[PDB]
Design a protein around this ligand. Structure first.
Ligand SMILES: Cc1cc2nc3c(=O)[nH]c(=O)nc-3n(C[C@H](O)[C@H](O)[C@H](O)COP(=O)(O)O)c2cc1C
Ligand code: SF4
Ligand code: SF4
Ligand code: SF4
Ligand code: SF4
Ligand code: FES
Ligand code: FES
Lengths: 127, 437, 178, 238, 61
């Protein structure tokens, strides 16, 4: 499917949010990894709009409180994930065309996300 | 009747229940007023430890968890007094799916269990017992804490007993769920308050275990069945089923079957008898039956299958085993893929991560195959893959969780293959189940 | 936390052999879990200090199990079974409805703050499938749109499930059809 | 002394020594990731699998870093079933290992890396060559994470041997690392900060993958290029 | 890879704000000695991101 395109565009969305919330609170933004399928590309033409496979929001102490990973080109169940560490909470965004980025069937929106971030932050952070 | 006692006939007498469903039966005094605690008094004032072993070793009792190890032998490994402690751990975290026999034993007739642990305790010279009750069972955990205070107050579960010199006590330790904690070695860590992962196997707890001192673990059924044995003789026990398949067992059933529940049937009984005579036939014809536990692998609905006994000696040979007697019936409305999908998303959840083969292999590789097949993004390749994955997992785990997760998917590709190949090869997702009321 | 609760400490520490000290982690946690509804760092640091063991161990033990929590819960922590049997009675579809009514999925809290949701695996009461467990208060056997909506409507109106009742019939240890 | 025959060669072996050593002693070889010298085996990485005879083989492959030794024992590490099971395990471990060799500062000296090239032989005369049979998204977690002024911690890389945790528990007696969740989700992490102990750093050599690295020497040369000069530490009298 | 020891690469730790290499690690010093070199091209084949790629200029002296 063309889901691919929307998925990546949604991944841009997640990133966009992460910079604003991050700068707002003074909590860090951090790139973790960049795609193998970018680093090791060198003659297969690149098409994607970002280079970042994994990224996180970190607290004052320096442990992450939120991890954010997209699936790259290779994948067979392409998804974007969130994970709160230590909490055993794992969220799976699929895309449903036009509906949005959904966690199952619930739309994942900015407001949703800010709340998710805050409950993470307030609970897990030590700083 | 007679020494091959199968089915309902007038000479089989219920004993493991006859009090459940009648609320207000968890009083010490209700139990006492049935003539209870005589049998404890008798063994304590009469027999030696050796005799209460030797009797049971004949009786036909054998492991009643998701294992079958003839219980005589299991006590035979005890050191029989050196000055070292001994502890009897009642494993009431039976939380393997499809299984719920143990739940009510704890809830309505606790003082029975407790008596059984007094009996067993005395035999292996153990002085303290932990009952590791499943954490989410709230009712059971109340009733057990309750029972143990009562029994202790009136002093039959005390620091000295009768005119005797055996002494015994119990503690409840309410768990926190988690299937893997059920495994016998896992439990000893779990209880000890470390993280729950199994231990190595060259010490057996009998020969050295829990905090250095030798431990014994027995199952809720196993313990409950000790009282009838000790009461009425080994002979009274031995009549039930074929030999090496003695005793009754608390069979349970679910699915779209007419009257599911616990049906206390003798062993060696046919499925046919259970599903029809007792459980009032099905509601939709069957695609497969997973007989006992969730460990065992499905058997297609067959006449020759229905007519096979329930034992550790007839289901053995049929490429299954008997888990907890908790049968599940699978109707043919839904897809086998969608059944196993749910089953192996469960097993994958509950691994412990200690082994590579089962950490990475099952909970990361295998499961995703299922996903692939059952989303219609599948292909023939994936089933070919899966097939080859199985001998690479079975062998190589460190504890038996893996083997319980592979067998269902092992058995299921021989018999129901067609469907798997269908949904994958044709790029067709599973249909949805349609049975929510 | 257990500073006021010192009888409770004597009570749980007494049960074990003195050399088996580490056992206490499970109950000590379990007290914090029921009464404040989700563990906090300070609790674990204290629990650690008490049992005379480094925090990191206690963290590992604590983080293993299914029951324990570490984030904002609601009032009614909704625990839907997702295993085989339950699927066959349409537990799947239950979770679809439930979640889409409330407006939140896993590890989130409802805007009122009365509802957290969370999956769980086989609860071992397959015959009366499905089931849910709210908080730690006995199993709501069966779920049907009615039975559910009654449970909901009560909780929403300021009454628990231990103090109200539902339509239907769910038996003692046998029950009927599916 | 107990008489063991591995494949076709015999070894003496003082009674009660793990099979693994008797294998290596005989000159045949097995891979192994979880059991380092002067640390107890808790056979867990599932690599050291052999088949054993006592003549009759056995229905399951024993992990040689665990079971004892006995009379006239045969231990086999050439057979079709052995190599096959190993091929399996190599692949399984590698399932979630993130790609990083060129920038991995564990360089040409990585137990995972080398084991792969040693044992991972599928079936491939004149066929297509085959590489990794995984084809779903990997684990992804944080990495490059300082635990202390001397130790940086990746958390993606790790293969979940027990070596580092095991060490901390047995040897300096201070626990400061221990596993977190469970199933596939599990990851090593801290809950004490700075790693207090004068002996924290040793795990860096101990980790047989590149998960645990020496921050003072993070990015200052690739592992092999160094000239490796044996000498003695004189900053104390030990 | 080289059989002349002609390529010396001192690595360095990437700025996070102005990365000069896509990966987390880069080459603060990259030197190549022509007067040693033999022009095998094993370097390029060995390089996994194919960064070093033999040229067309050759009028060097
Ligand atoms: C992976 C695994 C999980 C197990 N889980 C349980 C359990 O949840 N409950 C239980 O009573 N026994 C369980 N057992 C078996 C018991 O630990 C023990 O071996 C058995 O119950 C002893 O026989 P008896 O209980 O019939 O006396 C498990 C065994 C294995 C290998
Ligand atoms: S087989 Fe699984 S659940 Fe069992 S010890 Fe190994 S990783 Fe743990
Ligand atoms: S970081 Fe290394 S030593 Fe620690 S468990 Fe992992 S692979 Fe083993
Ligand atoms: S730890 Fe080893 S196998 Fe992993 S990226 Fe590093 S050099 Fe490679
Ligand atoms: S072509 Fe490259 S590998 Fe060959 S000598 Fe030159 S610098 Fe070395
Ligand atoms: S499958 Fe739900 S209670 Fe068993
Ligand atoms: S070295 Fe044997 S299982 Fe790890």
């Amino acid at each position: 499917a063309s889901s691919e395109r929307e998925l990546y565009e949604a991944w841009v969305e997640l990133l966009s949010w992460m910079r604003e919330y991050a700068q707002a609170k003074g909590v860090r933004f951090e790139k973790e990894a960049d795609f193998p399928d970018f680093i090791y590309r060198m003659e297969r033409p690149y098409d994607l709009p970002t280079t970042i496979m994994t990224a996180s929001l970190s607290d004052g102490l320096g442990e992450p409180f939120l991890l954010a990973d997209v699936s790259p080109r290779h994948a067979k169940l392409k998804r974007i994930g969130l994970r709160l560490p230590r909490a055993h909470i794992h969220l799976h965004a699929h895309y449903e065309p036009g509906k949005g980025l959904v966690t199952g069937k619930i739309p994942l929106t900015k407001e949703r996300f800010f709340a998710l971030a805050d409950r993470a932050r307030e609970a897990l952070a030590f700083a | 009747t007679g020494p091959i006692l199968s089915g309902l006939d007038p000479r089989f007498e219920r004993t493991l229940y006859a009090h459940v469903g009648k609320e207000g039966s968890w009083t010490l005094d209700y139990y006492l007023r049935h003539g209870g605690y005589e049998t404890a008094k008798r063994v304590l004032k009469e027999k030696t430890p050796d005799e209460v072993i030797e009797e049971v070793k004949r009786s036909g009792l054998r492991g009643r968890g998701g294992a079958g190890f003839p219980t005589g032998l299991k006590w035979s490994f005890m050191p029989k007094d050196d000055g070292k402690q001994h502890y009897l751990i009642c494993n009431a975290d039976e939380s393997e799916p499809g299984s719920f026999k143990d739940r009510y034993i704890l809830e309505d007739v606790p003082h029975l269990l407790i008596e059984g642990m007094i009996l067993a305790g005395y035999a292996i010279r153990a002085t303290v017992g932990y009952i590791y009750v499943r954490g989410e069972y709230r009712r059971a955990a109340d009733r057990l804490e309750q029972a143990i205070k009562e029994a202790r107050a009136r002093g039959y579960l005390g620091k000295n007993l009768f005119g005797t010199d055996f002494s015994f006590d119990l503690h409840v330790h309410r768990g926190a769920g988690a299937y893997i904690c059920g495994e016998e070695t896992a439990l000893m860590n779990s209880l000890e308050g470390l993280r729950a992962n199994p231990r190595l196997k060259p010490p057996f707890p009998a020969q050295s275990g829990l905090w250095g001192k030798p431990t014994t673990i027995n199952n809720v059924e196993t313990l409950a069945s000790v009282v009838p044995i000790m009461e009425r003789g080994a002979d009274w026990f031995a009549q039930m089923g074929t030999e090496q398949s003695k005793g009754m067992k608390l069979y349970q059933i679910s699915g779209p079957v007419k009257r599911p529940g616990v049906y206390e049937l003798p062993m060696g009984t046919t499925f046919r008898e259970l599903i029809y005579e007792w459980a009032g036939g099905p509601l939709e014809p069957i695609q497969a039956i997973i007989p006992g536990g969730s460990s065992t692998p499905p058997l297609p609905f067959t006449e020759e299958v229905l007519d096979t006994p329930m034992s550790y000696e007839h289901l053995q040979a049929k490429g299954s085993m008997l888990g907890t007697g908790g049968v599940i019936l699978i109707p043919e409305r839904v897809s086998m893929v969608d059944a196993m999908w749910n089953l192996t998303r469960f097993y994958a959840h509950e691994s412990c991560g200690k082994c590579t083969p089962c950490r990475e292999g099952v909970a990361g590789f295998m499961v995703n195959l299922f996903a692939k097949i059952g989303t219609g993004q599948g292909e023939e390749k994936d089933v070919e893959n899966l097939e080859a994955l199985l001998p690479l997992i079975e062998g190589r785990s460190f504890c038996p969780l893996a083997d319980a997760a592979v067998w269902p998917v092992k058995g299921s590709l021989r018999h129901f293959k067609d469907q798997y190949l269908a949904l994958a090869r044709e790029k067709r997702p599973v249909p949805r189940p349609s049975l929510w009321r | 936390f257990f500073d006021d609760k010192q009888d409770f400490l004597e009570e749980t520490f007494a049960k074990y052999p003195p050399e088996g000290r580490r056992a206490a982690i499970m109950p000590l946690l379990r007290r914090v879990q029921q009464e404040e509804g989700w563990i906090r760092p300070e609790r674990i640091e204290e629990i650690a200090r008490l049992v005379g063991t480094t925090p990191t161990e206690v963290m590992g033990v604590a983080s293993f199990y299914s029951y324990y929590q570490f984030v904002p819960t609601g009032k009614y922590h909704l625990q839907v079974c997702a295993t085989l049997s339950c699927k066959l009675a349409g537990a799947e579809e239950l979770w679809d409805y439930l979640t889409e009514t409330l407006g939140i999925g896993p590890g989130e809290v409802t805007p009122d703050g009365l509802f957290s949701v969370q999956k769980v695996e086989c609860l071992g009461s397959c015959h009366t499938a499905p089931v849910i467990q709210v908080n730690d208060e006995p199993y709501v056997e069966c779920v049907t749109r009615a039975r559910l909506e009654a449970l909901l409507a009560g909780l929403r109106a300021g009454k628990r499930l231990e103090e109200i009742e539902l339509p239907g019939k769910c038996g003692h240890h046998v029950h009927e059809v599916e | 002394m107990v008489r063991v025959k591995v494949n076709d060669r015999i070894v003496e072996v003082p009674p009660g020594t793990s099979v693994m050593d008797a294998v290596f002693h005989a000159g045949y070889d097995v891979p192994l990731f979880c059991s380092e010298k002067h640390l107890s085996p808790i056979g867990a990485c599932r690599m050291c699998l052999v088949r054993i005879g006592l003549i009759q083989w056995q229905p399951k492959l024993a992990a040689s870093c665990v079971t004892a030794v006995a009379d006239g024992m045969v231990v086999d590490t050439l057979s079709d079933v052995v190599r096959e099971a190993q091929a399996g395990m190599v692949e399984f471990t590698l399932l979630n290992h993130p790609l990083d060799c060129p920038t991995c500062d564990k360089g040409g000296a990585c137990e995972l890396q080398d084991r792969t090239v040693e044992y991972g032989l599928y079936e491939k005369p004149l066929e297509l060559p085959v590489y990794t049979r995984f084809e779903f998204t990997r684990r992804h977690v944080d990495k490059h994470h300082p635990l202390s002024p001397f130790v940086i911690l990746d958390r993606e890389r790790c293969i979940h041997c027990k070596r580092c945790v095991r060490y901390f528990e047995e040897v300096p007696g201070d626990e400061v690392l221990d596993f977190i969740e469970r199933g596939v989700h599990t990851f090593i992490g801290t809950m004490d900060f700075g790693l207090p102990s004068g002996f924290s750093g040793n795990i860096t050599d101990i980790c047989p993958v590149g998960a645990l690295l020496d921050l003072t020497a993070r990015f200052r040369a690739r592992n092999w290029e160094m000239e490796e000069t044996p000498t003695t530490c004189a900053l104390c009298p030990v | 890879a080289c059989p002349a020891y002609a390529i010396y690469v001192e690595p360095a730790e990437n700025d996070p704000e102005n990365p000069v290499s896509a990966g987390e690690r880069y080459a603060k010093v990259y030197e190549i000695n022509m007067l040693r070199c033999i022009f095998c091209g094993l370097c390029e084949e060995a390089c996994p991101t194919g960064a070093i790629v033999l040229g067309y200029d050759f009028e060097m002296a």
